[PDB]
Amino acid sequence: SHMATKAVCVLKGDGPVQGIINFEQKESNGPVKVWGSIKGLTEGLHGFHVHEFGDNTAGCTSAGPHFNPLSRKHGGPKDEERHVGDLGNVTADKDGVADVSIEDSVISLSGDHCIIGRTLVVHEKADDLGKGGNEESTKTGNAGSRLACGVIGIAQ
Amino acid sequence: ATKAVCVLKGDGPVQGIINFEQKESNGPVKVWGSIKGLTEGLHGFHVHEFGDNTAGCTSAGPHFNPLSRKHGGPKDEERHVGDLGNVTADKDGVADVSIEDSVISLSGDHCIIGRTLVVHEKADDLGKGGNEESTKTGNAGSRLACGVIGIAQ
Ligand SMILES: [Cu+2]
Ligand SMILES: [Cu+2]
Ligand SMILES: [Zn+2]
Ligand SMILES: [Zn+2]
Ligand SMILES: [Zn+2]
């Protein structure tokens, strides 16, 4: 019992980047709907992953690597070979506002792929989805630094 | 040996780091850390229902209360699962936190991972206040700092 069906995350950092991202999974093994808004972003694509640790002690850098329980290489959300936390990119319009609505079946709000208590992150550059051609791309997608993060938590 | 952490922030000077350790399932949890910016005295201290900060510490909801009981002190039988009692801040305004509770847990059905830790303005009267507020919040007043309890290395 008490397996979460709804979660929320408030993204914040040392810059103007901040938003609210909601999660929702009405079925235990079903997909998770991620939707919300993030502002303060440069127009274009930005990486969007669930990192391993809900540790904000040192900002977003304490959150650790991409949540990778299956010890896979980095990739796009649609790729088979991916990190559990690899949700791809979010797109910011010309006014810095990135409406977010993605749906993912790898992450879960309950079970072994459970993301509750971990850190959602949005990055400076685009997630090259592991196609970058260097070992860094296999690790992070060359998404750059962490502009904002927050701990994923149970929502009423 | 589960481990978690919580960075407490607010609209004021209160801020701290609070570590959790549950070395065994359904066993006791050690809560230790430091909170600066407090006013000399005791401050209410509990886990709330929701790890929801979309409206500051307000949106964290009431004390984690899966059993639907009345508020109490952590040694009481009639208590909210989240009811961790008080912490004490010196004349310095620094509170050194060290607690051990066997009701909260870092796993299980009623795990506090993903919920919110809140440090309150006033002392928690442990439900002995003689008013309906005492049996809900212990009259610990407004919420000064809070963070989502998250999974730590
Ligand atoms: Cu990331
Ligand atoms: Cu409280
Ligand atoms: Zn990845
Ligand atoms: Zn229950
Ligand atoms: Zn209580």
Numbering used by the authors:
A (entry chain B): -2 to 153
B (entry chain A): 1 to 153
Show passages lifted from the paper:
Cu-Zn superoxide dismutase 1 (SOD1), which catalyzes the conversion of two O2− anions into H2O2 and O2, operates mainly in the cytoplasm and plays a central role as a cytoprotectant against oxidative stress. The well-established ping-pong reaction mechanism of hSOD1 involves the sequential reduction and reoxidation of copper by two distinct O2− anions.
Using X-ray synchrotron cryocrystallography, we determined the crystal structure of recombinant wild-type hSOD1 (please see the Materials and Methods section, Section 4.1, for the sequence information) at a 2.3 Å resolution in the monoclinic C121 space group, with unit cell parameters a = 178.19 Å, b = 138.25 Å, c = 112.93 Å, α = 90°, β = 129.2°, and γ = 90°. In addition to 1 Zn2+ and 1 Cu2+ cation per monomer in the metal-binding sites and a total of 503 water molecules, the final model also includes 4 sulfate and 4 acetate anions originating from the crystallization mother liquor. The ZnCRYST anchors these residual His-1 residues in chains B and D, as well as the otherwise flexible His110 residues in chains A and C. Notable structural differences were observed in loop II (residues 23–27) and the Greek key loop, loop VI (residues 102–115), particularly around residues Asn26 and His110. Initially, the copper active site predominantly adopts a distorted tetrahedral geometry, where His46 coordinates through its ND1 atom, while His48, His63, and His120 coordinate through their NE2 atoms. The stepwise coordination of water molecules within the copper active site orchestrates a dynamic sequence of conformational changes in the catalytic region, guided primarily by the positioning of the bridging His63 and the copper-coordinating His120. Water molecules play a crucial role in reshaping the active site geometry, transitioning it from a distorted tetrahedral to a trigonal bipyramidal configuration. The orchestrated dynamics of water molecules influence both allosteric regulation and catalytic activity by interacting with Arg143, leading to conformational changes in the active site.
